[PDB]
Amino acid sequence: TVFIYIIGTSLPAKPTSPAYPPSGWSKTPPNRTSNTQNIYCSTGTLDPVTNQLVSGTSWSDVVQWSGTE
């Protein structure tokens, strides 16, 4: 899975909770105000049975979403 998940003014810190919807973190690219920007994370492999990140393989480095990934 790869989700784009912030209407953010500044670069955030990568999620720590291994849940496909992270801690209060959206699952789809939301709408933004002009000042804010979009940041995604190349989420590690997802486990459909548990619907969360498999043991290990934490979230990738958060990078501002420019155009398309």
Partner: protein
């Protein structure tokens, strides 16, 4: 009072009076009735009519009055005279369109930052980023602003946004849906084909010529 004659308006292509935009000029011939003291002209959209007193030499040479600073567009000029007893000529009308006070240079470039590399004229991101160069000869005019209009595939305007002191507009998806799809059809929707036109407008009747798009 017999109405004044030759009430005609001749545009001035390049006009400046004290470093401000000058539109054309409007001229007329003095009324043949004697004792006329001044010729009053009524200008649409203006509280104060323009009054120019005649002169002892007017009986021969027609007088002229200049109009400066008005924006490009239609003007209705009404000319009538007076008598020392207050008697007034029948008004004389002249409905014409006026050029901009200072024809401004078109926008140098006008493009979308978020454009697909595979092909031109395709924005990939949800929000359209619109940018353009600062107009030249900006230092000549103190205060300037641009008017941007957005059109649909089937030619219905969506918003007219006035931008001042910034040359990088940030179109948003939330705008396009909420403020536009509903307002144009009353139902939730998204417009995929877009259209943009921008003009550079000064204040004292200064307007660019030819629009600008991408």
């Amino acid at each position: 009072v017999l109405p004044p004659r030759d009430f005609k308006y001749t545009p001035t292509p390049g006009g400046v009076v004290g470093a401000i935009g000058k539109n054309g000029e409007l001229s007329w011939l003095p009324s043949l009735t004697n004792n006329v003291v001044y010729y009053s002209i009524a200008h649409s959209g203006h509280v104060n009519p323009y009054i120019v007193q005649q002169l002892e030499n007017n009986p021969n040479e027609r007088m002229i009055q200049e109009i400066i600073g008005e924006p490009a567009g239609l003007a209705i000029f009404e000319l009538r005279a007076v008598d020392i007893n207050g008697r007034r000529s029948s008004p004389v009308t002249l409905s014409v369109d006026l050029n901009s006070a200072k024809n401004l240079s078109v926008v140098s470039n006008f493009r979308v930052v978020n454009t697909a590399s595979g092909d031109v004229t395709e924005f990939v991101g949800p929000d359209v980023k619109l940018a353009w160069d600062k107009i030249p000869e900006e230092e000549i005019i103190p205060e300037i602003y641009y008017t941007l209009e957005i059109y649909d595939s089937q030619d219905r305007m969506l918003r007219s946004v006035r931008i001042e002191d910034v040359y990088t507009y940030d179109y948003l998806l939330t705008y396009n849906k909420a403020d536009f799809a509903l307002l144009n059809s009353g139902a939730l929707g998204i417009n995929r084909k877009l259209r943009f036109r921008i003009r550079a407008e000064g204040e004292n009747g200064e307007q660019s010529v030819g629009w600008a798009t991408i």
